[PDB]
PDB file of C-alpha atoms in Angstrom:
ATOM      1  CA  UNK A   1      -6.175  22.951  29.199  1.00 24.82           C
ATOM      2  CA  UNK A   2      -7.020  23.425  25.414  1.00 24.27           C
ATOM      3  CA  UNK A   3      -8.930  20.817  23.371  1.00 25.01           C
ATOM      4  CA  UNK A   4      -5.175  19.838  22.309  1.00 25.56           C
ATOM      5  CA  UNK A   5      -4.952  18.718  26.136  1.00 24.84           C
ATOM      6  CA  UNK A   6      -5.186  14.909  25.043  1.00 25.14           C
ATOM      7  CA  UNK A   7      -3.889  11.612  25.395  1.00 23.12           C
ATOM      8  CA  UNK A   8      -1.248  12.282  22.786  1.00 21.95           C
ATOM      9  CA  UNK A   9       0.416   8.923  24.018  1.00 22.40           C
ATOM     10  CA  UNK A  10      -2.847   7.166  22.867  1.00 20.48           C
ATOM     11  CA  UNK A  11      -3.279   8.897  19.695  1.00 23.15           C
ATOM     12  CA  UNK A  12       0.287   8.123  18.791  1.00 24.29           C
ATOM     13  CA  UNK A  13       0.008   4.378  19.632  1.00 27.06           C
ATOM     14  CA  UNK A  14      -3.108   4.216  17.751  1.00 29.59           C
ATOM     15  CA  UNK A  15      -1.854   6.021  14.545  1.00 27.53           C
ATOM     16  CA  UNK A  16       1.254   3.754  14.651  1.00 29.98           C
ATOM     17  CA  UNK A  17      -0.991   0.732  14.953  1.00 31.81           C
ATOM     18  CA  UNK A  18      -3.080   1.792  12.203  1.00 32.31           C
ATOM     19  CA  UNK A  19      -0.112   2.402   9.842  1.00 32.11           C
ATOM     20  CA  UNK A  20       1.543  -0.577  10.975  1.00 32.59           C
ATOM     21  CA  UNK A  21      -1.508  -2.706  10.028  1.00 34.03           C
ATOM     22  CA  UNK A  22      -2.610  -1.072   6.692  1.00 37.69           C
ATOM     23  CA  UNK A  23       0.914  -0.625   5.418  1.00 34.40           C
ATOM     24  CA  UNK A  24       3.053  -3.460   6.810  1.00 37.09           C
ATOM     25  CA  UNK A  25       0.288  -5.779   6.821  1.00 34.77           C
ATOM     26  CA  UNK A  26       1.888  -6.921  10.269  1.00 35.79           C
ATOM     27  CA  UNK A  27      -0.536  -9.179  11.931  1.00 36.08           C
ATOM     28  CA  UNK A  28      -3.883 -10.242  12.935  1.00 33.59           C
ATOM     29  CA  UNK A  29      -5.758  -7.462  15.086  1.00 28.90           C
ATOM     30  CA  UNK A  30      -8.998  -5.994  15.633  1.00 30.79           C
ATOM     31  CA  UNK A  31      -8.333  -2.660  14.109  1.00 30.22           C
ATOM     32  CA  UNK A  32     -12.253  -1.916  13.641  1.00 33.77           C
ATOM     33  CA  UNK A  33     -12.984   1.671  14.919  1.00 37.66           C
ATOM     34  CA  UNK A  34     -13.714   4.444  12.472  1.00 40.00           C
ATOM     35  CA  UNK A  35     -13.522   6.629  15.477  1.00 36.60           C
ATOM     36  CA  UNK A  36      -9.966   6.873  16.155  1.00 37.97           C
ATOM     37  CA  UNK A  37      -9.047   7.624  12.514  1.00 37.49           C
ATOM     38  CA  UNK A  38     -10.010  10.994  13.306  1.00 38.35           C
ATOM     39  CA  UNK A  39      -7.846  10.862  16.462  1.00 38.05           C
ATOM     40  CA  UNK A  40      -5.032   9.884  14.139  1.00 38.07           C
ATOM     41  CA  UNK A  41      -5.654  12.671  11.658  1.00 34.48           C
ATOM     42  CA  UNK A  42      -5.805  15.007  14.232  1.00 31.58           C
ATOM     43  CA  UNK A  43      -2.687  13.684  15.874  1.00 31.63           C
ATOM     44  CA  UNK A  44      -1.241  14.474  12.519  1.00 33.22           C
ATOM     45  CA  UNK A  45      -2.554  17.998  12.251  1.00 32.08           C
ATOM     46  CA  UNK A  46      -1.085  18.892  15.627  1.00 32.24           C
ATOM     47  CA  UNK A  47       2.188  19.647  13.485  1.00 32.24           C
ATOM     48  CA  UNK A  48       3.079  21.003  10.268  1.00 34.41           C
ATOM     49  CA  UNK A  49       5.178  18.126   9.772  1.00 33.84           C
ATOM     50  CA  UNK A  50       3.260  15.078   8.981  1.00 34.92           C
ATOM     51  CA  UNK A  51       0.608  17.391   8.031  1.00 35.21           C
ATOM     52  CA  UNK A  52       3.072  17.817   5.121  1.00 34.82           C
ATOM     53  CA  UNK A  53       2.119  14.078   4.215  1.00 35.87           C
ATOM     54  CA  UNK A  54      -1.499  15.247   5.068  1.00 36.43           C
ATOM     55  CA  UNK A  55      -0.997  17.455   2.139  1.00 37.45           C
ATOM     56  CA  UNK A  56      -0.803  14.662  -0.201  1.00 37.73           C
ATOM     57  CA  UNK A  57      -3.328  12.528   1.705  1.00 39.15           C
ATOM     58  CA  UNK A  58      -6.066  15.075   1.340  1.00 38.12           C
ATOM     59  CA  UNK A  59      -6.102  14.252  -2.240  1.00 36.08           C
ATOM     60  CA  UNK A  60      -7.934  11.026  -1.448  1.00 35.68           C
ATOM     61  CA  UNK A  61     -10.902  13.419  -0.902  1.00 41.33           C
ATOM     62  CA  UNK A  62     -11.448  13.842  -4.458  1.00 42.38           C
ATOM     63  CA  UNK A  63     -11.386  10.290  -4.686  1.00 38.38           C
ATOM     64  CA  UNK A  64     -10.216   9.863  -8.361  1.00 35.34           C
ATOM     65  CA  UNK A  65      -7.371   7.383  -8.069  1.00 40.26           C
ATOM     66  CA  UNK A  66      -4.808   9.592 -10.019  1.00 39.22           C
ATOM     67  CA  UNK A  67      -1.452   8.661  -9.951  1.00 42.07           C
ATOM     68  CA  UNK A  68       0.385  11.036  -7.690  1.00 41.24           C
ATOM     69  CA  UNK A  69       2.976  13.550  -8.837  1.00 38.52           C
ATOM     70  CA  UNK A  70       6.360  13.682  -7.636  1.00 42.18           C
ATOM     71  CA  UNK A  71       8.184  16.623  -6.687  1.00 47.87           C
ATOM     72  CA  UNK A  72      11.518  14.782  -6.231  1.00 45.30           C
ATOM     73  CA  UNK A  73      13.323  16.570  -3.187  1.00 45.99           C
ATOM     74  CA  UNK A  74       9.972  16.890  -1.281  1.00 47.72           C
ATOM     75  CA  UNK A  75       9.186  13.305  -1.919  1.00 47.55           C
ATOM     76  CA  UNK A  76      12.238  12.418  -0.518  1.00 50.35           C
ATOM     77  CA  UNK A  77      11.767  14.376   2.582  1.00 48.49           C
ATOM     78  CA  UNK A  78       8.530  12.680   2.702  1.00 50.05           C
ATOM     79  CA  UNK A  79       9.887   9.278   2.766  1.00 48.52           C
ATOM     80  CA  UNK A  80      12.513  10.345   5.367  1.00 49.67           C
ATOM     81  CA  UNK A  81       9.878  11.793   7.784  1.00 48.14           C
ATOM     82  CA  UNK A  82       7.525   8.846   7.170  1.00 47.21           C
ATOM     83  CA  UNK A  83       9.972   6.306   8.306  1.00 45.26           C
ATOM     84  CA  UNK A  84      11.044   8.605  11.139  1.00 43.07           C
ATOM     85  CA  UNK A  85       7.613   9.183  12.556  1.00 39.45           C
ATOM     86  CA  UNK A  86       6.843   5.654  12.081  1.00 37.34           C
ATOM     87  CA  UNK A  87      10.239   4.824  14.251  1.00 33.84           C
ATOM     88  CA  UNK A  88      10.941   1.608  12.173  1.00 35.50           C
ATOM     89  CA  UNK A  89      14.469   0.398  11.851  1.00 34.61           C
ATOM     90  CA  UNK A  90      14.541   1.512   8.258  1.00 37.03           C
ATOM     91  CA  UNK A  91      13.010  -1.503   6.790  1.00 35.65           C
ATOM     92  CA  UNK A  92      13.258  -0.261   3.287  1.00 34.58           C
ATOM     93  CA  UNK A  93       9.940   1.411   3.653  1.00 33.23           C
ATOM     94  CA  UNK A  94       9.436   2.873   0.210  1.00 36.46           C
ATOM     95  CA  UNK A  95       7.349   4.669  -2.380  1.00 34.23           C
ATOM     96  CA  UNK A  96       5.565   1.521  -3.072  1.00 33.11           C
ATOM     97  CA  UNK A  97       4.393   1.093   0.571  1.00 35.20           C
ATOM     98  CA  UNK A  98       3.670   4.823   0.350  1.00 38.82           C
ATOM     99  CA  UNK A  99       1.226   4.699  -2.484  1.00 41.85           C
ATOM    100  CA  UNK A 100      -0.198   1.261  -1.201  1.00 42.87           C
ATOM    101  CA  UNK A 101      -1.253   3.566   1.703  1.00 40.27           C
ATOM    102  CA  UNK A 102      -2.282   6.301  -0.192  1.00 37.65           C
ATOM    103  CA  UNK A 103      -4.713   3.841  -2.142  1.00 36.01           C
ATOM    104  CA  UNK A 104      -5.783   2.405   1.259  1.00 37.19           C
ATOM    105  CA  UNK A 105      -7.136   5.895   2.078  1.00 38.46           C
ATOM    106  CA  UNK A 106      -8.430   6.390  -1.342  1.00 42.72           C
ATOM    107  CA  UNK A 107     -10.464   3.175  -0.632  1.00 43.61           C
ATOM    108  CA  UNK A 108     -11.576   4.122   2.995  1.00 40.97           C
ATOM    109  CA  UNK A 109     -13.567   7.366   2.475  1.00 38.03           C
ATOM    110  CA  UNK A 110     -15.000   5.783  -0.757  1.00 40.33           C
ATOM    111  CA  UNK A 111     -17.364   4.261   1.775  1.00 45.89           C
ATOM    112  CA  UNK A 112     -20.217   6.353   2.913  1.00 43.88           C
ATOM    113  CA  UNK A 113     -20.919   2.872   4.515  1.00 47.09           C
ATOM    114  CA  UNK A 114     -21.490   2.595   8.113  1.00 49.22           C
ATOM    115  CA  UNK A 115     -22.993  -1.063   8.124  1.00 49.75           C
ATOM    116  CA  UNK A 116     -20.146  -3.836   8.872  1.00 52.78           C
ATOM    117  CA  UNK A 117     -17.981  -4.356   5.718  1.00 55.89           C
ATOM    118  CA  UNK A 118     -16.993  -7.680   4.601  1.00 54.50           C
ATOM    119  CA  UNK A 119     -14.601  -5.948   1.892  1.00 55.52           C
ATOM    120  CA  UNK A 120     -10.872  -7.021   1.644  1.00 55.76           C
ATOM    121  CA  UNK A 121     -10.151  -4.832  -1.165  1.00 53.31           C
ATOM    122  CA  UNK A 122      -7.109  -6.786  -2.008  1.00 49.05           C
ATOM    123  CA  UNK A 123      -6.952  -4.832  -5.435  1.00 45.70           C
ATOM    124  CA  UNK A 124      -4.779  -1.707  -6.041  1.00 49.63           C
ATOM    125  CA  UNK A 125      -5.309   0.596  -9.012  1.00 50.31           C
ATOM    126  CA  UNK A 126      -1.976   2.256  -9.117  1.00 51.47           C
ATOM    127  CA  UNK A 127       0.164  -0.362 -10.904  1.00 51.63           C
ATOM    128  CA  UNK A 128       2.000   1.946 -13.263  1.00 52.10           C
ATOM    129  CA  UNK A 129       0.195   0.740 -16.207  1.00 50.81           C
ATOM    130  CA  UNK A 130      -3.094   1.072 -18.129  1.00 50.45           C
ATOM    131  CA  UNK A 131      -4.433  -2.640 -17.519  1.00 49.18           C
ATOM    132  CA  UNK A 132      -3.453  -5.640 -16.231  1.00 50.10           C
ATOM    133  CA  UNK A 133      -1.367  -8.083 -18.399  1.00 48.34           C
ATOM    134  CA  UNK A 134      -1.546 -11.872 -18.047  1.00 47.57           C
ATOM    135  CA  UNK A 135       1.231 -13.704 -15.976  1.00 44.93           C
ATOM    136  CA  UNK A 136       2.136 -15.700 -19.030  1.00 44.42           C
ATOM    137  CA  UNK A 137       3.990 -13.043 -20.827  1.00 41.12           C
ATOM    138  CA  UNK A 138       6.025 -12.539 -17.765  1.00 40.31           C
ATOM    139  CA  UNK A 139       6.735 -16.386 -17.692  1.00 40.09           C
ATOM    140  CA  UNK A 140       8.341 -15.457 -21.214  1.00 36.83           C
ATOM    141  CA  UNK A 141      10.029 -12.564 -20.204  1.00 35.19           C
ATOM    142  CA  UNK A 142      11.757 -13.341 -16.917  1.00 34.67           C
ATOM    143  CA  UNK A 143      12.579 -16.945 -17.902  1.00 32.72           C
ATOM    144  CA  UNK A 144      14.310 -15.539 -20.828  1.00 30.55           C
ATOM    145  CA  UNK A 145      16.785 -13.183 -19.141  1.00 31.30           C
ATOM    146  CA  UNK A 146      17.196 -15.829 -16.310  1.00 30.26           C
ATOM    147  CA  UNK A 147      18.508 -18.132 -18.856  1.00 31.11           C
ATOM    148  CA  UNK A 148      20.790 -15.348 -20.245  1.00 28.24           C
ATOM    149  CA  UNK A 149      22.217 -15.047 -16.625  1.00 27.55           C
ATOM    150  CA  UNK A 150      25.154 -17.138 -15.469  1.00 24.05           C
ATOM    151  CA  UNK A 151      26.031 -19.089 -12.236  1.00 25.68           C
ATOM    152  CA  UNK A 152      27.004 -17.136  -9.239  1.00 28.06           C
ATOM    153  CA  UNK A 153      28.665 -19.904  -7.629  1.00 27.45           C
ATOM    154  CA  UNK A 154      30.020 -23.275  -7.779  1.00 24.56           C
ATOM    155  CA  UNK A 155      29.090 -26.228  -5.475  1.00 20.85           C
ATOM    156  CA  UNK A 156      31.673 -28.771  -4.832  1.00 20.79           C
ATOM    157  CA  UNK A 157      28.644 -30.816  -5.077  1.00 19.01           C
ATOM    158  CA  UNK A 158      30.375 -34.241  -4.239  1.00 21.11           C
ATOM    159  CA  UNK A 159      29.002 -36.460  -1.421  1.00 20.12           C
ATOM    160  CA  UNK A 160      28.502 -34.457   1.673  1.00 16.30           C
ATOM    161  CA  UNK A 161      25.915 -34.460   4.484  1.00 17.25           C
ATOM    162  CA  UNK A 162      26.263 -32.638   7.804  1.00 19.62           C
ATOM    163  CA  UNK A 163      24.885 -34.058  11.037  1.00 17.36           C
ATOM    164  CA  UNK A 164      25.266 -33.301  14.852  1.00 14.62           C
ATOM    165  CA  UNK A 165      24.878 -35.859  17.648  1.00 18.36           C
ATOM    166  CA  UNK A 166      25.077 -33.966  20.950  1.00 16.75           C
ATOM    167  CA  UNK A 167      21.933 -35.697  22.310  1.00 15.96           C
ATOM    168  CA  UNK A 168      22.214 -33.775  25.732  1.00 13.21           C
ATOM    169  CA  UNK A 169      22.675 -30.338  23.900  1.00 13.54           C
ATOM    170  CA  UNK A 170      20.010 -31.151  21.540  1.00 14.59           C
ATOM    171  CA  UNK A 171      17.484 -31.918  24.598  1.00 13.32           C
ATOM    172  CA  UNK A 172      18.692 -28.606  26.230  1.00  9.93           C
ATOM    173  CA  UNK A 173      17.524 -26.948  23.230  1.00 11.16           C
ATOM    174  CA  UNK A 174      14.196 -28.826  23.304  1.00  8.60           C
ATOM    175  CA  UNK A 175      13.622 -27.784  26.912  1.00  8.14           C
ATOM    176  CA  UNK A 176      14.569 -24.002  26.161  1.00  7.14           C
ATOM    177  CA  UNK A 177      12.118 -24.360  23.202  1.00  8.70           C
ATOM    178  CA  UNK A 178       9.296 -26.066  25.257  1.00  9.87           C
ATOM    179  CA  UNK A 179       6.891 -23.130  26.339  1.00 10.12           C
ATOM    180  CA  UNK A 180       5.991 -21.815  22.997  1.00  5.94           C
ATOM    181  CA  UNK A 181       2.654 -22.498  21.674  1.00  5.95           C
ATOM    182  CA  UNK A 182       3.809 -22.518  18.166  1.00 10.56           C
ATOM    183  CA  UNK A 183       0.654 -23.945  17.161  1.00 12.41           C
ATOM    184  CA  UNK A 184      -0.656 -20.324  17.517  1.00 14.31           C
ATOM    185  CA  UNK A 185       2.394 -18.534  16.597  1.00 11.71           C
ATOM    186  CA  UNK A 186       3.129 -19.833  13.106  1.00 12.52           C
ATOM    187  CA  UNK A 187      -0.379 -19.368  11.451  1.00 17.05           C
ATOM    188  CA  UNK A 188       0.496 -15.616  11.373  1.00 17.18           C
ATOM    189  CA  UNK A 189       3.897 -16.627   9.677  1.00 17.91           C
ATOM    190  CA  UNK A 190       1.778 -18.473   7.041  1.00 20.85           C
ATOM    191  CA  UNK A 191      -0.116 -15.302   6.597  1.00 21.79           C
ATOM    192  CA  UNK A 192       3.110 -13.393   6.115  1.00 22.42           C
ATOM    193  CA  UNK A 193       3.832 -15.650   3.170  1.00 22.71           C
ATOM    194  CA  UNK A 194       0.445 -15.153   1.935  1.00 23.42           C
ATOM    195  CA  UNK A 195       0.687 -11.381   1.989  1.00 24.81           C
ATOM    196  CA  UNK A 196       3.929 -11.776   0.379  1.00 19.14           C
ATOM    197  CA  UNK A 197       2.306 -13.785  -2.410  1.00 19.57           C
ATOM    198  CA  UNK A 198       0.452 -10.818  -3.554  1.00 19.10           C
ATOM    199  CA  UNK A 199       2.699  -8.141  -2.334  1.00 18.34           C
ATOM    200  CA  UNK A 200       5.104  -9.859  -4.812  1.00 17.54           C
ATOM    201  CA  UNK A 201       3.372  -7.624  -7.523  1.00 19.87           C
ATOM    202  CA  UNK A 202       2.159  -4.424  -7.869  1.00 22.75           C
ATOM    203  CA  UNK A 203       2.656  -5.205 -11.655  1.00 21.52           C
ATOM    204  CA  UNK A 204      -0.576  -6.376 -13.458  1.00 23.27           C
ATOM    205  CA  UNK A 205      -1.086  -8.331 -10.311  1.00 26.36           C
ATOM    206  CA  UNK A 206      -2.689 -11.823 -10.406  1.00 26.48           C
ATOM    207  CA  UNK A 207      -6.257 -11.820 -10.096  1.00 30.19           C
ATOM    208  CA  UNK A 208      -6.424 -15.795  -9.414  1.00 26.94           C
ATOM    209  CA  UNK A 209      -4.312 -15.635  -6.224  1.00 27.27           C
ATOM    210  CA  UNK A 210      -7.576 -17.311  -4.544  1.00 25.71           C
ATOM    211  CA  UNK A 211      -8.546 -20.763  -5.467  1.00 24.73           C
ATOM    212  CA  UNK A 212      -5.274 -22.489  -6.248  1.00 22.47           C
ATOM    213  CA  UNK A 213      -3.846 -21.029  -3.097  1.00 25.19           C
ATOM    214  CA  UNK A 214      -6.733 -22.740  -1.197  1.00 22.37           C
ATOM    215  CA  UNK A 215      -5.942 -25.830  -3.433  1.00 20.00           C
ATOM    216  CA  UNK A 216      -2.662 -25.865  -1.874  1.00 20.78           C
ATOM    217  CA  UNK A 217      -4.400 -26.256   1.650  1.00 22.89           C
ATOM    218  CA  UNK A 218      -6.708 -29.056  -0.114  1.00 27.69           C
ATOM    219  CA  UNK A 219      -3.614 -30.931  -0.652  1.00 27.23           C
ATOM    220  CA  UNK A 220      -3.790 -31.689   3.072  1.00 28.40           C
ATOM    221  CA  UNK A 221      -6.985 -33.542   2.352  1.00 25.66           C
ATOM    222  CA  UNK A 222      -5.290 -35.056  -0.753  1.00 24.67           C
ATOM    223  CA  UNK A 223      -2.668 -36.410   1.815  1.00 25.35           C
ATOM    224  CA  UNK A 224      -5.434 -37.776   3.900  1.00 26.38           C
ATOM    225  CA  UNK A 225      -6.853 -39.556   0.879  1.00 26.88           C
ATOM    226  CA  UNK A 226      -3.478 -40.837  -0.035  1.00 27.36           C
ATOM    227  CA  UNK A 227      -3.292 -42.500   3.648  1.00 26.92           C
ATOM    228  CA  UNK A 228      -6.832 -43.783   2.874  1.00 24.44           C
ATOM    229  CA  UNK A 229      -5.829 -45.123  -0.662  1.00 27.45           C
TER     230      UNK A 229
ATOM    231  CA  UNK B   1      -0.126  35.054 -24.536  1.00 30.42           C
ATOM    232  CA  UNK B   2      -3.518  35.987 -22.565  1.00 28.23           C
ATOM    233  CA  UNK B   3      -4.405  32.187 -21.948  1.00 29.83           C
ATOM    234  CA  UNK B   4      -1.187  30.668 -21.699  1.00 31.39           C
ATOM    235  CA  UNK B   5      -1.287  29.437 -18.116  1.00 30.00           C
ATOM    236  CA  UNK B   6      -4.612  27.937 -18.691  1.00 32.63           C
ATOM    237  CA  UNK B   7      -3.372  26.533 -22.011  1.00 33.56           C
ATOM    238  CA  UNK B   8      -0.280  24.909 -20.434  1.00 28.93           C
ATOM    239  CA  UNK B   9      -2.560  23.524 -17.697  1.00 27.04           C
ATOM    240  CA  UNK B  10      -4.751  21.913 -20.413  1.00 25.21           C
ATOM    241  CA  UNK B  11      -1.701  20.587 -21.908  1.00 24.95           C
ATOM    242  CA  UNK B  12      -0.278  18.880 -18.714  1.00 24.01           C
ATOM    243  CA  UNK B  13      -2.074  15.650 -19.228  1.00 24.99           C
ATOM    244  CA  UNK B  14      -0.614  14.515 -22.523  1.00 26.44           C
ATOM    245  CA  UNK B  15       0.229  11.720 -20.094  1.00 23.53           C
ATOM    246  CA  UNK B  16      -2.556   9.796 -18.635  1.00 24.84           C
ATOM    247  CA  UNK B  17      -4.462  10.632 -15.515  1.00 26.34           C
ATOM    248  CA  UNK B  18      -1.740  12.892 -13.869  1.00 25.19           C
ATOM    249  CA  UNK B  19      -3.048  14.621 -10.723  1.00 25.02           C
ATOM    250  CA  UNK B  20      -3.383  18.269 -12.045  1.00 26.67           C
ATOM    251  CA  UNK B  21      -2.403  20.458  -9.016  1.00 27.28           C
ATOM    252  CA  UNK B  22      -4.578  22.679  -6.917  1.00 27.65           C
ATOM    253  CA  UNK B  23      -4.680  26.425  -7.602  1.00 25.57           C
ATOM    254  CA  UNK B  24      -5.004  29.597  -5.721  1.00 26.71           C
ATOM    255  CA  UNK B  25      -8.338  31.482  -5.614  1.00 27.87           C
ATOM    256  CA  UNK B  26      -6.769  34.148  -7.771  1.00 28.01           C
ATOM    257  CA  UNK B  27      -5.497  31.460 -10.402  1.00 24.94           C
ATOM    258  CA  UNK B  28      -9.035  29.838 -10.469  1.00 28.98           C
ATOM    259  CA  UNK B  29     -10.907  32.919 -10.764  1.00 31.22           C
ATOM    260  CA  UNK B  30      -8.652  34.251 -13.577  1.00 30.36           C
ATOM    261  CA  UNK B  31      -9.134  31.004 -15.161  1.00 28.94           C
ATOM    262  CA  UNK B  32     -12.707  30.979 -15.127  1.00 30.02           C
ATOM    263  CA  UNK B  33     -12.676  34.598 -16.439  1.00 29.78           C
ATOM    264  CA  UNK B  34     -10.409  33.714 -19.437  1.00 31.93           C
ATOM    265  CA  UNK B  35     -12.424  30.615 -20.172  1.00 32.03           C
ATOM    266  CA  UNK B  36     -15.556  32.837 -20.426  1.00 33.42           C
ATOM    267  CA  UNK B  37     -13.531  35.517 -22.371  1.00 32.88           C
ATOM    268  CA  UNK B  38     -12.658  33.053 -25.226  1.00 32.78           C
ATOM    269  CA  UNK B  39     -16.008  31.333 -25.033  1.00 29.74           C
ATOM    270  CA  UNK B  40     -18.005  34.315 -24.547  1.00 32.88           C
ATOM    271  CA  UNK B  41     -21.298  32.403 -24.305  1.00 31.58           C
ATOM    272  CA  UNK B  42     -22.888  33.349 -21.002  1.00 33.98           C
ATOM    273  CA  UNK B  43     -25.839  31.845 -21.961  1.00 34.64           C
ATOM    274  CA  UNK B  44     -24.962  28.950 -19.696  1.00 32.34           C
ATOM    275  CA  UNK B  45     -23.209  28.561 -16.077  1.00 37.09           C
ATOM    276  CA  UNK B  46     -19.503  28.377 -17.006  1.00 37.57           C
ATOM    277  CA  UNK B  47     -18.555  25.839 -14.149  1.00 36.84           C
ATOM    278  CA  UNK B  48     -15.456  24.019 -12.713  1.00 38.21           C
ATOM    279  CA  UNK B  49     -16.800  20.560 -13.452  1.00 39.54           C
ATOM    280  CA  UNK B  50     -16.830  21.420 -17.097  1.00 41.57           C
ATOM    281  CA  UNK B  51     -12.951  21.533 -16.603  1.00 42.67           C
ATOM    282  CA  UNK B  52     -13.063  17.876 -15.392  1.00 43.66           C
TER     283      UNK B  52
END
């Protein structure tokens, strides 16, 4: 009968939803209530566990994007409890994801802004450097060591091609495949690749992710032009 | 010796933009006191933000 008498299940599901969004960047959703952010925080604070994370998360409120200090052992227990409470299958959820989320929260309250916000703050400050370099230097630096590195395998590389011909089998496959609205289902996959395109770096990250990535899709219209001579 | 906790706290940030830890009531108060005690110019309101 205390105020804690709550849909803890609802609050859990919504906390997990929020984390799943902002951290894993999982998939399209409509995660557009400031309201239940509070429900999430209180769901945290109904334990000194997870409040342990909140100890760090509080530092958002001073809003300066200072690079967080590590106390190594406790940060390790932090990572532990993080993945645990997230109940994820230990998908290598690491310090980089952690600080990404930290910066997410260090971007949220930043808004005193209640009007609808079209603001995809793709950027992150905390890239362990004073300021962003170009990519060209890395095009030097990785290429060099790559040329230093030596092949991990041989290919026999003679004439080989595989094929199969069990037409009935293949049709059985087709039928099993039939239901899926792949049309829908794969756009999110493409978005996955997109996310990965910038997740690739927390390291002087590319600014011009935008318009050449868009040009890739313009290549479809280029294909239509090639069809139309 | 008097000022050493303060002193080392100032020293901390030889590396850029590290998060200086939070301090207890007592710590902050002795800090402000010692600040005034070295810079005994109470003509102005010695203040936290001065530290930042």
